[PDB]
Design an enzyme around this catalytic site. Structure first.
Site, PDB file in Angstrom:
ATOM      1  N   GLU A 112     -20.897  35.584 -29.802  1.00 42.78           N
ATOM      2  CA  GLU A 112     -19.535  36.209 -29.703  1.00 42.78           C
ATOM      3  C   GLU A 112     -18.803  36.193 -31.061  1.00 42.78           C
ATOM      4  O   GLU A 112     -18.086  37.148 -31.372  1.00 42.78           O
ATOM      5  CB  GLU A 112     -18.691  35.565 -28.608  1.00 42.78           C
ATOM      6  CG  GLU A 112     -19.145  35.949 -27.204  1.00 42.78           C
ATOM      7  CD  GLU A 112     -20.490  35.341 -26.811  1.00 42.78           C
ATOM      8  OE1 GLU A 112     -20.757  34.198 -27.214  1.00 42.78           O
ATOM      9  OE2 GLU A 112     -21.250  36.011 -26.067  1.00 42.78           O
ATOM     10  N   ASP A 116     -22.649  34.668 -18.049  1.00 35.61           N
ATOM     11  CA  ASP A 116     -22.733  33.505 -17.145  1.00 35.61           C
ATOM     12  C   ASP A 116     -22.016  33.868 -15.837  1.00 35.61           C
ATOM     13  O   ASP A 116     -21.025  33.200 -15.431  1.00 35.61           O
ATOM     14  CB  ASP A 116     -22.262  32.257 -17.885  1.00 35.61           C
ATOM     15  CG  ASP A 116     -23.189  31.854 -19.012  1.00 35.61           C
ATOM     16  OD1 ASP A 116     -24.302  32.417 -19.073  1.00 35.61           O
ATOM     17  OD2 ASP A 116     -22.796  30.986 -19.828  1.00 35.61           O
ATOM     18  N   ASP A 176     -28.349  33.399 -27.882  1.00 38.82           N
ATOM     19  CA  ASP A 176     -27.176  33.137 -27.026  1.00 38.82           C
ATOM     20  C   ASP A 176     -25.972  32.719 -27.909  1.00 38.82           C
ATOM     21  O   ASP A 176     -26.210  32.193 -29.004  1.00 38.82           O
ATOM     22  CB  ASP A 176     -27.473  32.011 -26.049  1.00 38.82           C
ATOM     23  CG  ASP A 176     -26.559  32.011 -24.849  1.00 38.82           C
ATOM     24  OD1 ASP A 176     -25.769  32.979 -24.664  1.00 38.82           O
ATOM     25  OD2 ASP A 176     -26.649  31.046 -24.079  1.00 38.82           O
TER      26      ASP A 176
HETATM   27  C1  56I Z   1     -25.880  30.983 -22.935  1.00 37.26           C
HETATM   28  C2  56I Z   1     -26.339  31.970 -21.867  1.00 37.26           C
HETATM   29  O1  56I Z   1     -25.277  32.796 -21.393  1.00 37.26           O
HETATM   30  C3  56I Z   1     -27.020  31.311 -20.671  1.00 37.26           C
HETATM   31  O2  56I Z   1     -27.905  32.268 -20.062  1.00 37.26           O
HETATM   32  C4  56I Z   1     -27.771  30.097 -21.106  1.00 37.26           C
HETATM   33  O3  56I Z   1     -28.638  29.671 -20.046  1.00 37.26           O
HETATM   34  C5  56I Z   1     -26.790  28.987 -21.539  1.00 37.26           C
HETATM   35  C6  56I Z   1     -27.501  27.764 -22.121  1.00 37.26           C
HETATM   36  O4  56I Z   1     -28.308  28.114 -23.254  1.00 37.26           O
HETATM   37  C7  56I Z   1     -25.679  29.529 -22.480  1.00 37.26           C
HETATM   38  N1  56I Z   1     -24.360  29.416 -21.848  1.00 37.26           N
HETATM   39  S1  56I Z   1     -23.602  27.975 -21.904  1.00 37.26           S
HETATM   40  O5  56I Z   1     -24.260  27.023 -21.000  1.00 37.26           O
HETATM   41  O6  56I Z   1     -22.279  28.359 -21.458  1.00 37.26           O
HETATM   42  O7  56I Z   1     -23.692  27.471 -23.239  1.00 37.26           O
END
Ligand code: 56I
Ligand code: OXL
Length: 780
Positions: free
Chosen positions: A378, A443, A375
């Site tokens: 970018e 997200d 994750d």
């Molecule tokens: C990355 C990712 O897009 C999402 O699926 C994940 O559950 C979270 C936490 O690891 C990440 N996004 S964030 O909360 O915006 O960091």
């Protein structure tokens, strides 16, 4: 003001000199050319090309005012004064430079009137992005709904209704102007990086994509378990909670292949632990036992990882000591303030960073981790003064995720040469599919608008190399209480898109096993259907590995001389035979489906529809979403299993959709061990083919198997062939010359070898499909 000076040939490569410098033209294939400007000078290497250093023999003819450099399908026509390259498929003009290259990097080309332009990767702007301008800078769009000019996974590439693909082979912060500023100009800019584009032609959208994936990379077949059911949330807090979720799939009788662990596996808080890359033992006390216990139940464990190592993490000092982090210009570790705290970014472009990170992936994979989630690639935050071994943040930005995938892919192949890596990531580059990247649309908000955008995003990525693009099923971001109808519609759609991974913030359950009785009664048989359909889905996966044919295909594939279809983002093809129309608003009572002319069946109800162009109106129910089957389809099923580890095709059930409008039809089922990364290359597979010949008085099926087979392949499959819309006038079946009477009663209630159900217009044939050719002949 630019003009031809001279040109030489060097290893099938044309080197042209203008007033302003060198241009290197190399055919990477007969339908694909790399045009490198500033060829004299040191640049970043290609990222997009699977074989950067390749160039094939082309033919060069010099005239008065032009050169011509042809590969076979693709012709580069080089006007000497003013200097301008155009591109022909035969003598069909695809793309012509205007100013072409101007030195910040810039490229300008004409657009033809009525030319439609897909591309840019993830945007929510409409399928035709002509009239839009947007950056080339991978960035989060947390909680997006029905609009976005800039998200996680941009691609510096377009696909024209002229049937070319153009790639800007540049990793840097940049922009695309698609006849926005200047109605008839397409313009590519970058603040830095390589000054190179790639043109690819085809005779059709499928052969264009085959041509594109040939030179940018073919996705290796994922492990069949990637087509199964995932348990995921943000996030399981403990070993107990993770074990309790696997247990909930067992007690609720939902299929489960893989459980995914978010960032609580390495610390008790969202903030301040990232870079630990090791078990939080207070909350995960016996992780090796946990993964082994799951593996006994056929369940894989996938762990999240991120580029960032926080100064508060247990690995800060070691990462600094090993020189694994990207540096400031001073030469110290670059630290910067993320949501999670202050930290650095592992330098995957460096030897030291690659080896340090690789070593950690190796240790965790040895403990029992089956697959990997990367994750924030970018990268999510990437200050302009961060220094990577090969370039600064703004120069490498859009290739960080690409190289992270490459690094992790190489590592998994070197540790487990007999397994297919599973690498799920949010950001990459053109060609990242060659490292097995499986992307998701980040997200997304828990809104109808978030769902209503997913087909557009999936087709945009599918069209440019990413067959396994999918969404967080049910939606990810915010909300305070489940929108039950939206959730149900999202997980129905899920069955008919690449990866079945419900995922969201854990204040609302993402997993179907945690839903109410009504929701489970609707979704349980659809998640089973996903497993019963594995021979259909895995065959589309096989075709994707062979030709880059994406699993989701746009409506416009149905008629390549009707560009108006390009705008459609509400109906798509799931493999070759199913036209799916997701319901993307509450209370929709009926839908108008722009079914291509021909005969179509209701997937759920067997109802037969014919249309000469007029759309079809189908009612909607909460239990399903509208799916039509193409006349001539072979839909293969196996019995439902809880896990792909138990997959068998000893029992096949194949549904053939008969109509005299389709006098000839073919199907195939690709079978292998579901795990060997060398199965296709070494022909260690069982490729079943079915051909139907439908005339006025006969319906003939030819069945065959090719390939060398594989260990555990069944010699003989018990086959039930169900013929939908079967004539009531067939009296006799031949099977390899042996005549069998067709029963006309009690088909559901006898061990009938051939029985016609007059009420359902279904003719059922039950037989043994062994390794020898089988012919089934029905005659009136
Ligand atoms: C990355 C990712 O897009 C999402 O699926 C994940 O559950 C979270 C936490 O690891 C990440 N996004 S964030 O909360 O915006 O960091
Ligand atoms: O399709 C046929 O041949 C029929 O309907 O009898």
């Amino acid at each position: 003001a630019v003009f031809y000076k001279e040109h030489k040939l060097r290893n099938d490569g044309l080197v042209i000199t203008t007033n302003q410098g060198n241009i290197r033209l190399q055919f990477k294939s007969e339908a694909a050319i790399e045009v490198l400007y500033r060829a004299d000078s040191k640049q970043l290497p290609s990222f997009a090309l699977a074989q950067p250093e390749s160039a094939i023999k082309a033919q060069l003819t010099e005239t008065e005012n032009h050169l011509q450099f042809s590969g076979g399908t693709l012709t580069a026509r080089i006007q000497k004064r003013p200097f301008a390259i155009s591109y022909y498929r035969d003598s069909e003009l695809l793309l012509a430079e205007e100013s072409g290259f101007q030195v910040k990097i810039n490229f300008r080309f004409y657009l033809s009137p009525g030319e439609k332009i897909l591309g840019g990767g993830q945007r929510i702007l409409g399928m035709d992005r002509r009239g839009q301008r947007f950056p080339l800078y991978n960035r989060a769009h947390y909680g997006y709904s029905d609009h976005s000019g800039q998200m996680y996974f941009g691609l510096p590439a377009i696909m024209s209704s002229k049937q070319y693909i153009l790639v800007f082979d540049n990793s840097a912060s940049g922009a695309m102007d698609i006849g926005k500023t200047e109605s008839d100009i397409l313009q590519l800019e970058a603040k830095s990086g390589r000054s190179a584009y790639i043109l690819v032609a085809g005779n059709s959208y499928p052969s264009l994509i085959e041509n594109f994936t040939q030179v940018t990379g073919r996705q290796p077949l994922p492990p069949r378990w990637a087509l199964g059911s995932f348990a995921s949330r943000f996030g399981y807090r403990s070993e107990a909670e993770t074990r309790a979720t696997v247990q909930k799939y067992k007690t609720e009788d939902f299929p489960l292949d893989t459980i995914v662990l978010d960032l609580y596996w390495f610390g008790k808080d969202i903030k301040g632990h990232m870079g630990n890359l090791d078990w939080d033992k207070e909350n995960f006390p016996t992780p090796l036992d946990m993964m082994a216990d799951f593996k006994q139940q056929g369940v894989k464990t996938v762990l999240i990882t991120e580029p960032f190592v926080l100064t508060s993490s247990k690995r800060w000092d070691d990462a600094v000591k090993a020189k694994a982090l990207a540096k400031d210009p001073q030469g110290q570790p670059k630290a910067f303030e993320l949501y999670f705290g202050n930290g650095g970014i592992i330098d995957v472009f460096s030897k030291e960073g690659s080896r340090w990170f690789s070593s950690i992936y190796k240790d965790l994979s040895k403990q029992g981790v089956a697959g990997w989630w990367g994750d924030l690639g970018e990268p999510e935050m990437h200050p302009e003064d961060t220094q990577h071994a090969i370039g600064d943040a703004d120069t490498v930005h859009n290739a960080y995720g690409h190289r992270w995938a490459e690094m992790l892919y190489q590592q998994q192949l070197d540790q487990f040469p007999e397994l297919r890596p599973f690498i799920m990531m949010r950001a990459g580059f053109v060609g990242s599919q060659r490292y097995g990247m499986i992307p998701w649309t980040g997200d997304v908000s828990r809104t109808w608008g978030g769902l209503a955008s997913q087909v557009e995003l999936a087709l945009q990525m599918s069209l440019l190399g990413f067959g396994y693009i999918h969404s967080d099923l049910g939606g990810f971001a915010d909300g305070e209480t489940l929108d039950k109808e939206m959730y149900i519609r999202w997980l129905q759609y899920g069955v008919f898109q690449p990866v079945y991974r419900p995922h969201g913030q854990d204040h609302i359950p993402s997993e179907p096993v945690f839903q109410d009785e009504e929701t489970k009664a609707i979704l349980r048989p659809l998640v089973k259907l996903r497993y019963r359909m594995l021979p259909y889905i895995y065959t589309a996966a096989y075709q994707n590995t062979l030709t880059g044919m994406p699993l989701m295909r746009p409506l416009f594939f149905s008629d390549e001389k009707n560009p108006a279809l390009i705008d459609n983002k509400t109906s798509y093809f799931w493999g070759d035979s199913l036209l799916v129309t997701p319901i993307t608003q509450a209370g929709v009572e009926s839908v108008s489906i722009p079914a291509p002319k021909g005969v179509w069946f209701d997937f759920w109800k067997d109802t037969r529809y014919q249309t000469d162009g007029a759309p079809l109106t189908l009612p909607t129910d909460l239990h399903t979403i509208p799916v039509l089957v193409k006349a001539g389809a072979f839909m293969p099923y196996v019995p439902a299993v809880s896990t792909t580890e138990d997959y068998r095709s000893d029992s096949l059930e194949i549904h053939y959709y008969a109509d005299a409008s389709v006098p000839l039809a073919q199907g195939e089922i690709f079978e292998d061990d579901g795990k060997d990364p060398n199965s296709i290359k070494r022909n260690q597979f069982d490729l079943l083919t079915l051909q139907a010949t439908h005339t006025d008085n006969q319906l003939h099926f030819q069945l065959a198997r090719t390939g060398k087979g594989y260990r555990g392949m069944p010699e003989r499959r018990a086959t039930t062939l169900v013929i939908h819309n079967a004539s009531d006038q067939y009296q006799h079946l031949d099977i390899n010359g042996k005549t069998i009477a067709i029963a006309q009663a009690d088909c559901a209630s006898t061990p009938a070898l051939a029985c016609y159900d007059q009420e359902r217009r279904q003719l059922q044939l039950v037989f043994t499909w062994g390794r020898e050719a089988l012919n089934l002949r029905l005659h009136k």
